[PDB]
Amino acid sequence: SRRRQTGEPPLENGLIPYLGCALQFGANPLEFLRANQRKHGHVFTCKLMGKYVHFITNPLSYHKVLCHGKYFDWKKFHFALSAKAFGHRSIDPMDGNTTENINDTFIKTLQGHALNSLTESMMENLQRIMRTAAWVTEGMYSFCYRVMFEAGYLTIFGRDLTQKAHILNNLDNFKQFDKVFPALVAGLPIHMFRTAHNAREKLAESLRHENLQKRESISELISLRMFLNDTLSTFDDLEKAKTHLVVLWASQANTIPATFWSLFQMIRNPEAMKAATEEVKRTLENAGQKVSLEGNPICLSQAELNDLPVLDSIIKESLRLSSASLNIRTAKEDFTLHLEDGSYNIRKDDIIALYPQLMHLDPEIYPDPLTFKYDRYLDENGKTKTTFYCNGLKLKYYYMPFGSGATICPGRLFAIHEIKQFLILMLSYFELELIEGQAKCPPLDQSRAGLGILPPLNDIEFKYKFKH
Numbered sequence: 001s002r003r004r005q006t007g008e009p010p011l012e013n014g015l016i017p018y019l020g021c022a023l024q025f026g027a028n029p030l031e032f033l034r035a036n037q038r039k040h041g042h043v044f045t046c047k048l049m050g051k052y053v054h055f056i057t058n059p060l061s062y063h064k065v066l067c068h069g070k071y072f073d074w075k076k077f078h079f080a081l082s083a084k085a086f087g088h089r090s091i092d093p094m095d096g097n098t099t100e101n102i103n104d105t106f107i108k109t110l111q112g113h114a115l116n117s118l119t120e121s122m123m124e125n126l127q128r129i130m131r132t133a134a135w136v137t138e139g140m141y142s143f144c145y146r147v148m149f150e151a152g153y154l155t156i157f158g159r160d161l162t163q164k165a166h167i168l169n170n171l172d173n174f175k176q177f178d179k180v181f182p183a184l185v186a187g188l189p190i191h192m193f194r195t196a197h198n199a200r201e202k203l204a205e206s207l208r209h210e211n212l213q214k215r216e217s218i219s220e221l222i223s224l225r226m227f228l229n230d231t232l233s234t235f236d237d238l239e240k241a242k243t244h245l246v247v248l249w250a251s252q253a254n255t256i257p258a259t260f261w262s263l264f265q266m267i268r269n270p271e272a273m274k275a276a277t278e279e280v281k282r283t284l285e286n287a288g289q290k291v292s293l294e295g296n297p298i299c300l301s302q303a304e305l306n307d308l309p310v311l312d313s314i315i316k317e318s319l320r321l322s323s324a325s326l327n328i329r330t331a332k333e334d335f336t337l338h339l340e341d342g343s344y345n346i347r348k349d350d351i352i353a354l355y356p357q358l359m360h361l362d363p364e365i366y367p368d369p370l371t372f373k374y375d376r377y378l379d380e381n382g383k384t385k386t387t388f389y390c391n392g393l394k395l396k397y398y399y400m401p402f403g404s405g406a407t408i409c410p411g412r413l414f415a416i417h418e419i420k421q422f423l424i425l426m427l428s429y430f431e432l433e434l435i436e437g438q439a440k441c442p443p444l445d446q447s448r449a450g451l452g453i454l455p456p457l458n459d460i461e462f463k464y465k466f467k468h
């Protein structure tokens with residue numbers, strides 16, 4: 001076994017060989033870390049699934065970790081996770097299967113100019129899917145899944161302009177595969193889950209280059225990713241298809257619960273709904289956009305979308321409460337980490353992690369942290385508030401659902417645009433209400449801890465009726 005040495009943080013080895021604290025950590029991730037915070041302070045080491053994870057819990061120490069250091073490796077763990085879960089060979093250039101910098105691929109196609117067409121495509125696709133008036137009762141999460149999945153799929157992978165059952169099949173397959181994702185990350189083989197195994201292979205088949213080339217309006221991302229698969233990799237046809245499944249999962253898995261919580265919190269709070277309705281009404285008027293189901297589709301520019309402070313605040317506050325990401329980096333060699341709490345010795349191949357849900361729900365940073373306050377990221381005038389403090393010091397990192405530094409989601413700008421577009425269209429098309437307005441906020445499904453946004457454990461019913 002491993003023993004704590006000179007300078008090294010307090011070590012918690014756990015009661016199980018290999019797993020260590022994994023079981024206890026999985027049982028209640030936030031309370032497990034909070035209990036270790038009381039027992040060991042802001043810096044402690046946990047043996048998890050064969051690894052030794054140093055947790056940095058002081059929000060004032062996040063900057064020393066999120067920096068581009070010569071001792072950190074921020075790809076090796078992610079690349080391995082992807083390989084195991086999606087069933088492709090190593091995408092690490094050191095392994096010689098590809099020479100592609102996937103980070104460069106994502107930057108080039110999810111940001112800058114590429115973002116314009118991608119944003120424009122999402123708005124067209126959403127409107128295609130969403131367009132005597134009667135009240136339709138449905139599960140809010142079920143609704144958000146239908147709408148966001150189909151729109152997201154068509155925006156990223158283009159349209160087959162030749163078929164409704166096929167969209168429904170991909171939808172169902174994705175639900176079946178995504179259901180066992182926490183187990184796949186843990187190390188359990190997909191073979192063990194027959195339904196999910198078949199689902200993953202069916203998803204992969206439809207994303208083969210031969211099937212993708214037959215589609216209209218493919219994203220610059222996938223068309224670049226196809227080109228680089230052929231030019232810079234030695235992957236087989238199915239492996240190439242599985243690299244597109246990684247991108248499908250990445251574009252859907254966090255957007256769907258993110259969309260649910262934003263929609264839910266906006267309707268649940270009458271104050272948030274009234275403000276958002278007025279903002280969308282104001283924005284559409286100034287852009288000369290008329291909401292008509294039979295006429296021409298609405299068009300909003302990136303500039304118009306980025307100037308929605310109320311919606312931005314609603315999304316940010318929705319993510320603040322539901323984000324459960326695990327910010328990880330690995331030690332390249334043995335070194336000493338210098339933090340506000342002290343100096344700690346870290347060994348080679350050790351993991352240095354952040355669980356920013358500890359910060360998002362910190363009462364010292366966010367007063368009444370478990371309450372949804374729609375204007376939490378707004379000032380007196382109604383402009384985005386970027387100043388948050390912690391024990392007197394102004395915080396550089398205060399909101400991290402997409403991560404930060406080099407370990408940041410490249411799809412963040414698109415993610416916020418597509419949620420905004422869904423909310424704009426939902427407010428413009430329908431009259432919205434809940435089955436039980438005075439019903440409790442659903443508990444977060446903790447089985448998805450470390451994988452991004454936590455979905456609700458149980459779905460909430462809601463009603464919608466198109467406007468005249």
Ligand code: HEM
Pocket residue numbers: 078102103106110247250251252254255258325326327328401402403404406407408409410411412414415452453
């Ligand atoms: C609410 C929406 C989303 C959330 C909260 C989210 C969150 C994240 C987080 C936390 C990571 C890992 C950050 C880290 O390295 O510690 C990540 C990675 C990534 N996300 Fe997002 N994401 C979202 C939407 C999207 C969308 C719409 C796309 C579209 C393509 C996307 C593409 C990716 C990709 C490709 C990576 C991996 C980057 C790399 O390893 O090189 N994400 N995202």
Ligand SMILES: CC(C)CCC[C@@H](C)[C@H]1CC[C@H]2[C@@H]3CCC4=CC(=O)CC[C@]4(C)[C@H]3CC[C@]12C
Pocket residue numbers: 078079081082091102243246247250324325326327450451452
């Ligand atoms: C060309 C492809 C093979 C690119 C591969 C991208 C892989 C490495 C990326 C895409 C989406 C990323 C995940 C996004 C969601 C996420 C949230 C977290 O809080 C921890 C890290 C994870 C679990 C990420 C791990 C690495 C993933 C799976």
